[PDB]
Amino acid sequence: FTYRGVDLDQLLDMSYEQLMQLYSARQRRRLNRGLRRKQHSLLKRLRKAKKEAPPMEKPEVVKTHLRDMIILPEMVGSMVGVYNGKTFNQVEIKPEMIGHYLGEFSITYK
Amino acid sequence: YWSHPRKFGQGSRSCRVCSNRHGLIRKYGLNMCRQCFRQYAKDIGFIKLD
Amino acid sequence: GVTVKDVNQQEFVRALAAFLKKSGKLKVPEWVDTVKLAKHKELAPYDENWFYTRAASTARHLYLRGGAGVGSMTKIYGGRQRNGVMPSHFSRGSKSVARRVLQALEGLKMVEKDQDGGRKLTPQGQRDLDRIAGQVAAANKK
Amino acid sequence: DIKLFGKWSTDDVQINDISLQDYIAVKEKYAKYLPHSAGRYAAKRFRKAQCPIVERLTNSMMMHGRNNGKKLMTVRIVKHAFEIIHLLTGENPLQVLVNAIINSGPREDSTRIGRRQAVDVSPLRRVNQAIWLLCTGAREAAFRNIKTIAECLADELINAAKGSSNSYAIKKKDELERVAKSNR
Amino acid sequence: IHRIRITLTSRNVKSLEKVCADLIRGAKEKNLKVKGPVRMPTKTLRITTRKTPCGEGSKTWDRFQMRIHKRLIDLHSPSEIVKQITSISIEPGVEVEVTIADA
Amino acid sequence: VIPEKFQHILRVLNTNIDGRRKIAFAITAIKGVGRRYAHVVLRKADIDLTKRAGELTEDEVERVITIMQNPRQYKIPDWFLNRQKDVKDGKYSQVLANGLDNKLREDLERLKKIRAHRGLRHFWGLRVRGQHTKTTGRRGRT
Amino acid sequence: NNLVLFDKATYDKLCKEVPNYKLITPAVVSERLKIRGSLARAALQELLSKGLIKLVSKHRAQVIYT
RNA sequence: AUUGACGGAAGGGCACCACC
RNA sequence: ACGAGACUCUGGCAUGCUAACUAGUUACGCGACCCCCGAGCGGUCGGCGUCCCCCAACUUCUUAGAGGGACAAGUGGCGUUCAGCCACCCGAGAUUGAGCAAUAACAGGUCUGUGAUGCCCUUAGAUGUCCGGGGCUGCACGCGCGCUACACUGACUGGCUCAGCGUGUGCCUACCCUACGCCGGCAGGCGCGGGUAACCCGUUGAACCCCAUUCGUGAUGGGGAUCGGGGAUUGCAAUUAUUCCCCAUGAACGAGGAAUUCCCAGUAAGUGCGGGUCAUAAGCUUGCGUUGAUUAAGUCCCUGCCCUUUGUACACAC
Ligand SMILES: [Mg+2]
Ligand SMILES: [Mg+2]
Ligand SMILES: [Mg+2]
Ligand SMILES: [Mg+2]
Ligand SMILES: [Mg+2]
Ligand SMILES: [Mg+2]
Ligand SMILES: [Mg+2]
Ligand SMILES: [Mg+2]
Ligand SMILES: [Mg+2]
Ligand SMILES: [Mg+2]
Ligand SMILES: [Mg+2]
Ligand SMILES: [Mg+2]
Ligand SMILES: [Mg+2]
Ligand SMILES: [Mg+2]
């Protein structure tokens, strides 16, 4: 797997500013303006729930209302429950969804 | 409480007579509902010449 | 005696463009072959030497109603934009073409910077445009 | 000496039909340099019979809604059609136009009373009908075809003025008279 | 001595013109070079609304409008003389704005 | 006036480029090449725009293929290209006749294996750009 | 199926019977001889340059020869 | 017997929200 | 007597009056440029000045006040010699366009405009109110208002030349219109100045149109739906794509059945520009100018209204 030429481990190492050049214009503008306390707390909880799971099983699901949180490369592998208005749909974050938002993985209709 | 930003949009603006948010007239700095304008027009000075 | 007003402008522009292209002193940007002259065009200009024609046209447009800038220059060269299935609207021309053209003319010593703001025509620009107008008016009566 | 478009004389035309003499306005007072004037001819009744016939032909060519209001275009296509006529025939284009009006006008129509009883046709209305038939013949001949509207207008009213049946207006006139004769 | 400019604004022509007449006459009586009434283009403020309070009917509209008229008077005289030229029974719908050669 | 080596039809990129058509609009029959890209390609090469496709010989055809296959080498700007900042490769380039179909297929399957919203709406066969589906789009559906 | 470029027979016909038309214009030479309008304009401009035919009028929409 | 409304009654007039 | 008309606003006229550096014109002086023999009460100038008070006057154009002006007044004809109608002269104009708009009504619409309101319901696990997310936009289909088109009376590229309404920095209220200079191919970005406005944007360099080039009757360089990739802007947040820009893909559509709408003079139609909505934004509406017609000066056939006569077992109107 590669994302705009660069591999996953380098994507993990680089800062937000270097990461901005590998995104689309929408995600670069969203990272140019800050990330508020909601997204920082979501990243905190995702990090905490990934660093406490035993080996060879998925991390515990982390529910969230934030459907507009872009998927950083420190979110891959982790399990998220995204609200769709009524329920928390489970999304296993796979490395291909770096660019996309969390919102377009929990459908809000039928 | 009143945490959500209300710096623009229909939520920010309300009529200066009834505090209704629909049909608002903002031209010339009125900030009045269309019906309230239609009622107070003669008092404000908006004659209906043509 | 002849002046720029006393001659067909559509042929005066071709004469001035041929003059500018003749004397190899106009500066051309490297992207001339790859750009549309406005966001409302569909293709690039059909004329390879479009830069000389645009420079001559704005030299004429600075002889009369002098004192202009890149904004007014992109409202002179703006046109109609067809928005697909939506109605059409007036849209301005590209600013970089206009700025490069005016700076190239400034490098030719024809155009200079006005006092209040904008760009006007030097006495040398007046002299050159009037001599070109004399040439086209003379070549019309033969 | 007022010449249409600067080159077409107007005192040697001949309206050979007495009925249409005072509706095809082309000479002595009606001479003009161009088929364009701020008209005010639709103000009162019959005032459009005092309009030059080339300006009526120009007016009736601004049609189908993509050419509405575009009068300068119709003025130049009339100018170019007249030059084509003078090349093809070898006679004054105003004469050819006047003869096309006279030949292409229907002189007996059929109105709906009910079955359609035959009726006679006014001179002004048959001038109107002649102009409209020539214009629509030219218009439908130039649509989806490599010929231009000037050549189609020229060949239309040339075939009209000569009287042949390959024009569209002569076909329509013959059809109108044929029904209005079979249904008297 | 200054270039004092009096600007008069009103919504009706009658009282505005009569206040202008009073000012010009008072200034002419005391021998002033009075550059007389300049008339700026009247501003028409227009608001077109729907007539109905609900949204049902025949879609008729209501065209309210308000005109604003503006007049100018230029005096060339000391301040204390304009302080008695003015202050003579200004009509209600008229509003004056003295500008004493500076903002 | 016709040259005896007039190629009536071309086979440039496993596609049939119709001769008897103007060269700038001839190569437009290749998928991935449109009017603006064809004009900038033919302008970077020394090919006269006022030519019917069949009038060219093999040298100009090979040069046209080389310039359109490798646009960045011949100073065609990055913003011109179809596939800028590729998701997987990361390389700026222009996808041609068969590459644009493999790339469109690979794009839809990327967005569909991931179960994104746009990919699901492509799989179901609906509009994916926010359009109202209530009254339009009924042709392609039973 | 208009010819984009003249062959020998059509070029012979254009040189041997087009300068004897009362009306010459790019829409009647491109219909008697089956050629495209662009080839017609090119051919008539070449004939005018050589001097066989005379220009009556020149417009951006209609050009007329003799 | 009177006023209104109606008549798949009988006469007049009007309207490019009717026609020609 | 009310309604109609009169009335009010608006359009058209005034070389007559009142005036104007927040509008100009014309002279004069200075300056630039062009011809020239030596040339000139020569030509172009939205270049500058006459606002230090004469070292220039004036109001034609612009603005807006007061008056004037049109009344079927004059001349023929018809008409009961009546009201009036038709034509014509002189005229700016011989029917400019709207606003207001009666007696009675309608179970017409609005309790979702209101600190207009009766009654009923609910009132702390609230139908109050706030916050987070979703939805109004969902898609086999059936209608209505529209926008773009089907091309050559055209599309594309370049060149040249013209508008009129009117808006603009805000109590709470954050959010204005923008000239000029420099980056960028574009959307855009960064500096810096003017404007609370006849002062600045702005002489609002609008589009159609006009002039030249390419194409050539082909679903084509007509049409631009659908869709892939990228770049910016607004926002606290753009995915179910806000909007804008660039490359690419290139569908139906070849003038539309039965039916049906709207309209008679600067009108229909074409074509753009403002206002409202608006942090972001018009395929909508409301106004504005621009190019500018075909047909008609009639009728009761169709669709509806109004009057009169006539029949009624109808009066909550069969
Ligand atoms: Mg323009
Ligand atoms: Mg044609
Ligand atoms: Mg659908
Ligand atoms: Mg009809
Ligand atoms: Mg009800
Ligand atoms: Mg109510
Ligand atoms: Mg909520
Ligand atoms: Mg809705
Ligand atoms: Mg409706
Ligand atoms: Mg196109
Ligand atoms: Mg195509
Ligand atoms: Mg708007
Ligand atoms: Mg709406
Ligand atoms: Mg109807």
What is the per-residue DSSP string for chain F? ---TT--SEE-TTSS-EESSSBHHHHGGGSTT--HHHHHHHHHHTT--SSSBGGG--HHHHHHHHHHHHSTGGGT--GGG-SB-S-SSS---B---TTHHHHHHHHHHHHHHHTT-HHHHHHHHT---SS---SSS--TT--
Non-local CB neighbours of F52 within 8 Å, separated by 6+ positions = F19, F20, F21, F22, F23, F26, G4, G5
Which tokens is B10 given? 């229909």
Domain membership of residue E25 as a residue range: 1-103
Non-local CB neighbours of A110 within 8 Å, separated by 6+ positions = none
Residue nearest to nucleotide I31 (CA to C1'): C123
Cβ–Cβ under 8 Å, residues A102 and A64: yes
Rg (CA), chain A: 14
| Chain F residues within 8 A of G4 when measuring between CB atoms | 20-21, 52
Closest CA to A65 of A47, A82, A45: A82
Number of domains in chain E: 1
> In one letter, which amino acid is C71?
G
Domain range summary for chain F, segments of one domain joined by +: 1-77, 78-142
Domain range summary for chain D, segments of one domain joined by +: 1-184
Closest-CA residue of F relative to G10 is F1
Cβ separation of G11 and F1 shorter than 8 Å?
A: yes
Neighbour count for residue G24 (Cβ, 10 Å): 24
Which tokens is G56 given? 């009556």
Q: Is the CB of D140 under 7 A from strand I?
A: no
Domain membership of residue B41 as a residue range: 1-50
Q: Is the CB of C30 under 7 A from strand I?
A: no
CA dist D65 and C9 (Å) reads 33
b or e along E16-27 (b: 16 or more beta carbons within 10 Å of the residue's beta carbon)? Answer: bbebbebbbebb
Closest CA to D80 of D7, D160, D164: D7
Which tokens is C114 given? 């006005």
Non-local CB neighbours of D120 within 8 Å, separated by 6+ positions = D107, D108, D109
Cβ separation of E66 and B46 shorter than 8 Å?
A: yes
Instruction: Please state, in angstroms and as integers, the Cα–Cα distance from residue A58 to each residue in C89, D2, D151, following that order.
Output: 56, 98, 81
Contact of F51 with chain G, judged by CB distance below 8 Å, is answered with no
Q: How far is the CA of C68 from the C1' of I273 (A)?
A: 23
Per DSSP, G24 falls in state B
CA dist C30 and C34 (Å) reads 9
Q: How far is the CA of B35 from the C1' of I66 (A)?
A: 39
Pairing between β-strand A79-83 and β-strand A62-64 as defined by DSSP bridges: parallel
Cβ separation of E49 and B46 shorter than 8 Å?
A: no
| Chain G residues within 8 A of D146 when measuring between CB atoms | 27, 30-31, 37
Residue with tokens 């050049």: A21
Instruction: Reduce the DSSP state of residue E30 to 3 states and report it.
Output: coil
Which tokens is C77 given? 């060269």
Where would I find the beta strands (DSSP E) of chain D?
108-110, 118-120
Q: Is the CB of F131 under 7 A from strand I?
A: yes
> In one letter, which amino acid is A12?
L
C-F contacts at Cβ under 8 angstroms: 20
Which tokens is A32 given? 């140019």
Subunits touching E (CB < 8 Å, at least 3 pairs)? Answer: B
CA dist C113 and C18 (Å) reads 25
Q: CB-based burial of residue G11 (10 Å sphere; 0-12 exposed, 13-18 middle, 19+ buried)?
A: middle
Distance F82 CA to ligand 12 centre (A): 34
b or e along F81-116 (b: 16 or more beta carbons within 10 Å of the residue's beta carbon)? Answer: bbbebbbeeeebbbbbeebbeebeeebeeebeebeb
Resolution in A: 3.1
Domain range summary for chain A, segments of one domain joined by +: 1-110
C window 21-80, beta carbon within 8 A of F? 31, 33-34, 36, 42-44, 46, 48
Residue with tokens 């003389």: E81
Closest CA to G64 of G49, G44, G43, G37: G44
Per DSSP, A101 falls in state B
Pairing between β-strand C119-121 and β-strand A88-92 as defined by DSSP bridges: unpaired
> In one letter, which amino acid is D79?
K
| Chain G residues within 8 A of D76 when measuring between CB atoms | 59, 61
